[PDB]
Every structure is written in structure tokens, then in C-alpha cells.
Chains A and B, each alone.
Chain A
Amino acid sequence: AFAVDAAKAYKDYLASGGQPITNCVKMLCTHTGTGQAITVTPEANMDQESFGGASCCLYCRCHIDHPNPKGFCDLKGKYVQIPTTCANDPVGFTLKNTVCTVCGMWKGYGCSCDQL
């Protein structure tokens, strides 16, 4: 019944004033992309940075099993768009936030499916 909870540990470390994980791999791109959250090629728009996905995955970076029962990674081998205001902690961002399954944008950072 015991499993390491890395998500919670990083969230608690951050709140305790810990330095966010570094060396997430930021890509050069046009910043004229779709703005979707996780894509096969960089898609940052004007208000985002695009990062190599593996380098932004808590489980990849910590060398621990992915929560998937099959171990698959949402991010590895893809690019993740991170709001520029949050790009000091991409790992924190991807952990804390969620992608809209309809439009592919981040909930609350591009997703407008819940608007009138």
C-alpha cells in the first residue's frame, strides 16, 4: 500500500520556498503557433515558451515511475507550451495544470470552452 508521492513532495517543496527544477530545455521557435498545451513540434504563441517535454516532466527528471498504470509519459517526445509568466517553473506548471481534452489548450490559460 506504499507508493512515493512525488507530485505532492514537489508541491510542498515549492510552497516551502524551494528553487524550481532547472535546465528545462527551452526551444527556439517563431512564437506564432497555435498555443496548444502539448504538441508534436513547438507551438508557442506570443505569450508562451515552448520546451522539450521530457525535460519538463517531474517523473522523467526525478527518474521515477510515471503514474500511468502503463508508465506512459504525456510529455516525452513532445513539446510543452508554458505561459511566459510561469516559465521559471515549467515542471511545476505541467504538474499543477490540466489540458482541455476538447481544444488542447491549458485549462485557464487558453481554454475558452467554458465561456458563453
Chain B
Amino acid sequence: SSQAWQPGVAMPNLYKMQRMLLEKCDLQNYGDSATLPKGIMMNVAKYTQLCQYLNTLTLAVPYNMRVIHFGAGSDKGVAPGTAVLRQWLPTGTLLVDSDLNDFVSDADSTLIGDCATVHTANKWDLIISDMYDPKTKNVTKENDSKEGFFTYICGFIQQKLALGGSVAIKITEHSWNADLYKLMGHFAWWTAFVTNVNASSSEAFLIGCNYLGKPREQIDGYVMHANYIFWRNTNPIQLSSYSLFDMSKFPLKLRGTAVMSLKEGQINDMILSLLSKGRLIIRENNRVVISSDVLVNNENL
């Protein structure tokens, strides 16, 4: 009932526990659009609701936080989602974004190129991805796990997400990857969150809350995506913009979460318990250095 006053709807735990088979996604409210406040873009609204939901979880929020945002450019040449993330994150948070095509951004640094060309020396506290190829919405072909940028994202998380860190990765009916769902089991908690403003779409953000660096739970990703679609197919979400009108508690609280460098082998059950509670980040606190690989070619004669 009250779901219309929330920023969106997270997949209830019982649907996560099913063993459904994958079906086509048929949303009753398909094609409907929410009424956005005057002059507000869908992507501003969408990221605001995502951030409002993230405010309800046990995110670690250290001093000198590091956040990276893939898929940040729009067809308009600007980065609406980055602008919302920077509003949401504490002032001074280091924010890097990236996209295939050129765009103008408020991030501290921007890398233009395929995500597979992005390398970073440091680990990150939060990874956001809006990466999406609309050519995947081919309803006439079978819906298999996709590779492409999802393969990169899975490796990036395992190699460069700090222990205690969190992610939010955009998926849809056809844009999904089984190993990414499997990796959700390496977090203390996970969900698939649907924004109320975009509830007529099969889009969701797959959210991993507090990374543990090892499986807490064995998740079959083909089954979990079928479970996700089953949920969407059987649970119409009323489009709603209601939460956009109350921003008083929007900013992410600067928790000053502790950061420690530790070697694998110092990670005991007390450490894992603190990681699982949003009370600790494990990574080095060096300087943040990034780069984009550039392919060189000379096309002459």
C-alpha cells in the first residue's frame, strides 16, 4: 500500500529463495510513465530514489571515500546520475565516472572509453553502474546470461572493491549476468531494487551491501534471475514520484567508518562481523590513480 511513498521496492527475501524457471517479463504497468516534478529528468529522479534506498542500508562511509560510476554519460552529453551521486555523497568524496562516449561531468575525473580499458591502482568503497546496451532488448531471441561489460564488472569487484564496500549495478530482463548474481553471495546482504519512478520497466539495481571477499552464500545466478523476473511478473509496482518531494534527509551520513589495511589471514570472524555491519573498510588509503588504455593505430596508406 505504502510502497508508493517509498523510493522504490526491494525484492522480498522469499522470492530470493525460490527455484523458478526463466520466463518472459510481462509488466502490467508497462508503457506507463510516472509524473515527474516540473523540469526534472528521469535519470535525476531514478538516481535520487536509488540513493534514498541506499540511505536505508548499512553502507560504510569513511573519510576520503572513493566512489566510481560506470555508464555515466547520457545521450544528452551530460551526467545526471553523477550529479545526483555527488549531491548525495559527503562533500569531498572522490568521485570518478566513465562511459563509452564523450560527456560533460561534475565528477573529479572522467574516463572516456570502453569500461574494459579502465584501470585503477586503488580500491573503491562504492561502485555504481548504469551500463546498458539497449540492443539487448531483443524479445525474439533466447535470454541468456550476458558477458561484455558484466564480465568486466565482476572482475573489477573482485579485484578493486574494498572489503566492506558496496555496489549497485543496473540490470534488466535481458541485461544481466549469472556470475554477478553469484557474486551477490559474497556480500553480507544483497537485493534487487526497483525505483518507483521506473517501476514500469524490468530494470533493477542489483545491490551488494558490505563486501566480504568470499562466498557467504552459494547463489546460482541463472535461477536467481528467474526468481527476480518471477517477482516482477507477479508483483505490479505502482509508478510513483512521491519520495522525490522530500529531500530533507537525502545526504548520506558521513559515518567516519574506520579504514584499515590488513592482509588476508588477519581477516577473522570479529573482522568479518564488523565488515558485515557497515563498521569497517579494508583497503590501503593511498592516493587515487586511474587510467584508460588507448589503442594506437596509424591508418595512413
Contact = CB atoms under 8 A, between A and B. Distances in A.
A27 B87 contact: yes
B105 A54 contact: yes
Given A27-B84, A54-B79, 7 more contacts: A23-B41, A23-B76, A25-B44, A28-B44, A30-B247, A54-B78, A57-B104
Interface string A15-43: 00000001111111110000000001110
Nearest to A77: B106
A83 interface: no
Contacts of A61: 77-78, 104
A79 B104 contact: no
A21 B40 CA distance: 16
Which has the most chain A C-beta neighbours within 10 Å: B44, B106, B250? Answer: B106
Contacts of A6: none
A26 B39 contact: yes
Chain A interface mostly:
loop
Size bracket of the A interface: 20 to 34
Contacts of A42: 87
17 contacts: A23-B74, A25-B41, A25-B44, A26-B44, A27-B84, A27-B87, A28-B45, A28-B48, A29-B247, A40-B91, A41-B87, A41-B251, A52-B79, A55-B104, A55-B106, A60-B104, A76-B105
Nearest to B91: A40
Given A41-B91, A55-B78, A87 B39 contact: yes
A53 interface: yes
Interface in B64-111: 74, 76-80, 82-84, 86-87, 91, 102, 104-108
Contact of A77 (B44, B108, B244): B108
A27 B104 contact: no
Given A26-B41, A60-B104, A61-B104, A52 B244 contact: no
A76 B106 contact: yes
B248 A30 contact: yes
B215 interface: no
A23 B39 contact: no
Contacts of A30: 247-248
B107 A77 contact: yes
Contacts of A54: 78-79, 83, 104-106
A79 B85 CA distance: 12
Contacts of B41: 23, 25-26
A28 to B, nearest CB: 5
Given A27-B44, A28-B247, A87-B39, A52 B108 contact: no
A25 B80 contact: yes
B261 to A, nearest CB: 29
B256 interface: no
B37 interface: yes
